[PDB]
């Protein structure tokens, strides 16, 4: 079974999620004929740098001509899809970074392309190249032969010398949005005929940050754990994240200074056998979200809709100073947790400390 | 088609090169009066005209009419040098060939008289990458050069060269092209190319060039690609915003003026582009420290931070020192407590909120 | 020859592994459904069986019968892997092979077909110790390797790995074994080994294991060696230096009443008796936590402390919760920095002094 990431690599400019600006620029350049000879791509991991680079290379060498909408069926397109085209020289700079390799590469750039109209060099992981390798490419980048094009992809463009950055057109790819990742996952699962639920897709998109490859890997892991299906419970178990309802209830109990309710809920959580560090992190995240809501109404997204209204109630009643005090207390408790005699004891003592210094209802003093 | 805008508009006459008046005047006077040194060394930043000026000098040093500062451009020698296939003009890319053997052969080649030129000029580019033995051989050859041999050297890091080689050649240092000259050159190029443009777009491109005409031309070409055959204010502004990577100073400026929505927008924009949060925090700390030191003394701000000199100077002038100190302290506390935050982004947002609309209570020695 | 219990009782089948139910279920589902990935990363604390899980997975992949989640353990491939001489299983100690040359040599042999097995498995132990260049070199091949090679990664510090590697691997987090599971495994091993034992000794060893099975086995072996071949409760208590008596209660009472002479005399007597200071600090922290919890609710006191219940109750009636929190925090800080003190006794005395401020010859063959 070929993995989802390799199977679903885009094969056309209509199959790429987001990245509207770079796609529009490339399409306009190919249509108008104003084609440069050095392209650099930058962005975070798993956002489609190599994919768009290969798509551009296929578009340049298509038999029908130079178009922004390659056919995808001619011999050149098929060979490039299969990764065996002769005129697409793909180089792994991370594996070959010595200067002599660059000298050997540049010694035979004058020869005409074997079959295609252009001989496209696609270098990956450029930042791993040595300084001498960087210097050796300056003249070739400035004045390459008419039948040579350079495509460069890297994750940290700040590592390159300024001289190289001034020789090539730079395109920066942005992290994909949560909605885009969710839509792509839904489409892929529908094409693969796999059962899924909206909550599972939402959780996977949230946990994927902005890299779609991470989302695909998490989806594959969830499918493996779920035994051929994607279920909300399976995703929750995989991520090991408790539902927001329990943490929200615990925070509400803490705010109102109800020691018995807090202790009972902690005992129930212990019976459930959840992780204590995850519980503390969730409580801190809830407090941070409440503080940001206090800062501005729009700071809360739809991901919290299921509890949004209730959370909003805490925004208009707790003074900001109390929120800051609770946040700092929980942060300090999490800081000192590793040295505590037990995780359960540490969390219980942190909650007791929070209750003792409660601004409004402190525990009674002795007499 | 259309070649490349930078590669197409390389100057071919002393009247076309813009700026660098002192170097051009000195070279013209030296050629007119017959005072020609045995070795020249051009230095400066990237994309200022070192190679162009070297090629112009070589063309004017072997013209059929005679040694002049205004070469005809029509005789055989001028045409061949323009085509880059002149017999006597031996141009060597030192970066690609740094070993002792290549330099040894090239320097041994000097023993032969020129074929069809009064001088045999060697144009060594990127001289700082030569090996130590290569430098020794070059020094041995250059101590007593023949009367018919001249050396032209172009480099960007002259400090790498040994003192002995530096003492044997006359050094010309080029300066930044400034905003106005770059803007005028872009206007002229676009007028010649029959491309629509707006003054504000050209001003923005010149400002973003940062004293490098090659960068300005590359950005102009990219904007033309994005603008669909024309340059417009909106397209250029969007392109720069996509390429903008100075979120730290913008965040500091927004925070200092007590704005919340702007800070959230800047945080979202920074999150869109792959960025390390701790790097952003330390950058903000450094900016605040620099502003404080500038407030202490106007000479603190060096020439390195020339791009953002005006905004930082204005912030130092307007913001009272106490606010700067408080912001520095709170951001230092935020950096200290960052690793224990529930999430890097949430921790950064919390620290920004604290610096924006909060004030810590100092221990205040009570005893 | 004789082998320690830690290595002799290494699990050989999926039925001999305690806990880690989610990981085993995911692996079994993936093997059954045929969805085989080419990058598995086992992360977690130490002494939980990452290497054992990786070896079992590799054995299952290269079994003669076929790709099964239950390796036979008797065919030639299984026994060859058990003996560690299997040709197609390349076990790489990343802690001693960090140089780029070794990784480059490794990646140049990935294009050859397996010798006898159906897959070529690379098991990299402690991959977090490789250099940056090693990670970058791996990236390209790990992204899309051939169809006859599988990569298995085991580490205990996933933070070290760059995000690029993590984005292209299936991550499996191993939980820490509970006290009950460790006790069950220990009693099973001892019964199989024909070693006398008592429930209290096993409970103490499980508690001291701190969630690591390797640590539990090492402690059991130490007790057996020093216990004259018998795991006795008295021997384990002596080895572990358990307080047993109510010394911690007396010390905490003396500290609370702020009687320097009493606490100093108690510490001197304890040092004369030669007890473990870490155990004393842990016991004091537990007593403080119990006192605070009882102060929360009178019924929170456990039934095992009846013999010292009454005294504790008095503390809960005479000490405000804030003072209890302060004492707990001070003791925790003292525990944290105990190793860094010049002497353990000096550290304990310093912590207690800090707390007191709170108040209203037969020579064989050696020269």
């Amino acid at each position: 079974y070929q993995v989802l990431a390799r199977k679903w690599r885009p094969q056309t400019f209509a199959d790429v999620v987001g990245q509207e600006h770079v796609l529009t620029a490339l399409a306009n350049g190919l249509s108008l004929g104003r084609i440069h000879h050095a392209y650099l791509f930058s962005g975070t991991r798993g956002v489609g740098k190599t994919s768009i680079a290969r798509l551009l290379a296929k578009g340049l060498n298509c038999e029908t001509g130079i178009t922004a909408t390659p056919c995808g069926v001619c011999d050149n397109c098929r060979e490039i899809e299969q990764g065996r085209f002769v005129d697409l020289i793909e180089i792994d700079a991370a594996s070959r970074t010595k200067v002599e390799d660059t000298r050997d590469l540049l010694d035979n750039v004058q020869y005409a392309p074997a079959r295609g109209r252009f001989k496209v060099y696609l270098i990956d992981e450029v930042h791993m190249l040595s300084r001498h390798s960087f210097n050796a490419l300056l003249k070739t980048l400035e004045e390459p032969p008419e039948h040579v094009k350079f495509l460069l992809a890297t994750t940290d463009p700040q590592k390159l010398p300024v001289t190289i950055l001034s020789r090539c057109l730079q395109f920066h790819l942005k992290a994909l949005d949560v909605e885009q990742i969710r839509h792509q996952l839904e489409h892929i699962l529908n094409e693969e005929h796999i059962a899924h639920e909206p909550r599972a897709l939402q959780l996977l998109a949230r946990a994927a940050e902005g890299s779609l490859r991470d989302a695909l890997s998490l989806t594959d892991q969830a499918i493996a754990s779920g035994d051929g299906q994607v279920s909300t419970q399976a995703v929750s178990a995989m991520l090991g994240t408790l539902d927001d309802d329990q943490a929200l209830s615990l925070v509400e109990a803490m705010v109102e200074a109800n020691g018995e309710r807090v202790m009972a809920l902690i005992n129930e959580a212990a019976a459930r056998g959840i992780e204590w560090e995850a519980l503390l992190v969730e409580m801190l995240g809830l407090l941070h979200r409440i503080a940001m809501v206090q800062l501005s109404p729009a700071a809360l997204g739809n991901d919290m809709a299921a509890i949004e209204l209730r959370m909003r109630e805490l925004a208009r009643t707790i003074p900001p100073t109390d929120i800051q005090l609770y946040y700092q207390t929980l942060l300090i408790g999490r800081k000192e947790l590793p040295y505590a005699p037990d995780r359960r004891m540490g969390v219980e003592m942190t909650l007791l400390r929070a209750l003792a210094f409660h601004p409004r209802m402190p525990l009674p003093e002795p007499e | 088609s259309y070649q490349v805008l930078a590669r197409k508009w390389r100057p071919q006459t002393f009247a076309d090169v813009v700026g660098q008046e002192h170097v051009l005047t000195a070279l013209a006077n030296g050629l007119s009066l017959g005072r020609i040194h045995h070795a020249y060394l051009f230095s400066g930043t990237r994309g200022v005209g070192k190679t162009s000026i070297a090629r112009l000098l070589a063309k004017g040093l072997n013209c059929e009419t005679g040694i002049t500062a205004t070469p005809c451009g029509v005789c055989d020698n001028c045409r061949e040098i323009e085509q880059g296939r002149f017999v006597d003009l031996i141009e060597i890319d030192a970066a690609s060939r740094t070993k002792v053997e290549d330099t040894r052969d090239l320097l041994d080649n000097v023993q032969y008289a020129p074929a069809r030129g009064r001088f045999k000029v060697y144009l060594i580019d990127e001289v700082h990458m030569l090996s130590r033995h290569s430098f020794n051989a070059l020094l041995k050859t250059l101590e007593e050069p023949p009367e018919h041999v001249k050396f032209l050297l172009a480099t960007t890091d002259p400090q790498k060269l040994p003192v002995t080689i530096l003492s044997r050649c006359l050094q010309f240092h080029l300066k930044a092209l400034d905003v106005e000259q770059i803007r005028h050159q872009l206007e002229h190029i676009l007028n010649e190319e029959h491309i629509a443009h707006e003054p504000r777009a050209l001003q923005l491109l010149a400002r973003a060039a940062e004293g490098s005409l090659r960068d300005a031309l590359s950005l102009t070409d990219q904007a033309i690609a994005s603008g669909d055959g024309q340059v417009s204010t909106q397209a250029v502004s969007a392109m720069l915003g996509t390429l903008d990577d100075d979120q730290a100073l913008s965040l500091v400026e927004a925070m200092v003026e007590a704005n919340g929505e702007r800070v959230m927008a800047l945080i979202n924009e920074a999150a869109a582009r792959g960025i390390e949060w701790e790097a952003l925090l330390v950058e903000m700390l450094g900016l605040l420290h620099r502003i404080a030191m500038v407030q202490l003394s106007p000479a603190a701000l060096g020439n390195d931070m020339a791009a953002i000199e005006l905004r930082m100077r204005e912030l130092a002038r307007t913001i009272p020192p106490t606010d700067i100190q408080l912001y520095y302290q709170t951001l230092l506390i935020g950096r200290k407590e960052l690793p224990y935050a529930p999430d890097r982004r949430m921790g950064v947002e919390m620290t920004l909120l604290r610096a924006l609309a909060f004030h810590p209570r100092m221990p205040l020695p009570e005893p | 020859s004789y082998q320690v219990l830690a290595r002799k009782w290494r699990p050989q089948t999926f039925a001999d592994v305690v806990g880690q139910e989610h990981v085993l279920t995911a692996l079994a589902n993936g093997l059954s459904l045929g969805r085989i990935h080419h990058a598995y990363l086992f992360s977690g604390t130490r002494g939980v069986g990452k290497t054992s899980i990786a070896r079992l997975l590799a054995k299952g992949l290269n079994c003669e019968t076929g790709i099964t989640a239950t390796p036979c353990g008797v065919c030639d491939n299984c026994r060859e892997i058990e003996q560690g001489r299997f040709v197609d299983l390349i076990e790489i100690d990343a802690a001693s092979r960090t140089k780029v040359e070794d990784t480059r040599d490794l990646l140049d042999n990935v294009q050859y077909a397996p010798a006898r097995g159906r897959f070529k498995v690379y098991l990299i132990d402690e991959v977090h110790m490789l250099s940056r260049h090693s990670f970058n070199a791996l990236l390209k091949t790990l992204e899309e390797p051939p169809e006859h090679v599988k990569f298995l990664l085991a580490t205990t510090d996933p933070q070290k790995l760059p995000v690029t590697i993590l984005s292209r691997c299936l991550q499996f987090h191993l939980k820490a074994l509970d006290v009950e599971q460790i006790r069950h495994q220990l009693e099973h091993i001892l019964n199989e080994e024909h070693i006398a034992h008592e429930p209290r000794a096993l409970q103490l060893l499980a508690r001291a294991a701190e969630g690591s099975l390797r640590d539990a086995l090492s402690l059991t072996d130490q007790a057996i060696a020093s216990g004259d071949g018998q795991v006795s409760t008295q021997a384990v208590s002596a080895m572990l230096g358990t307080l047993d008596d109510d010394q911690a209660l007396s010390l905490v009472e003396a500290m609370v009443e702020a009687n320097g002479e009493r606490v100093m005399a108690l510490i001197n007597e304890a040092a004369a008796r030669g007890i473990e200071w870490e155990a004393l600090l842990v016991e004091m922290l537990g007593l403080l936590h119990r006192i605070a919890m009882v102060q929360l609710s009178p019924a929170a006191l456990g039934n095992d402390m009846a013999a010292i219940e009454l005294r504790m109750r008095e503390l809960a009636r005479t000490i405000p919760p804030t003072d209890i929190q302060l004492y707990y925090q001070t003791l925790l800080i003292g525990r944290k920095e105990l190793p860094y003190a010049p002497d353990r006794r000096m550290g304990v005395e310093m912590t207690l002094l800090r707390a007191l401020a709170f108040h209203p010859v037969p020579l064989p063959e050696t020269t």
Binding site: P320 | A357, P360 | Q325, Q329
Partner: peptide, 29 residues
């Protein structure tokens, strides 16, 4: 000053006081 403030200072918890209430944009009591 106050015993509670001294205890919070000793515990390492930093107490934050609002300086610019106008900065916050929302219903806050």
């Amino acid at each position: 000053t106050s015993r509670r403030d001294w205890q919070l200072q000793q515990l390492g918890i930093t107490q934050w006081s609002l300086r610019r209430p106008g900065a916050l944009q929302g219903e806050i009591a």
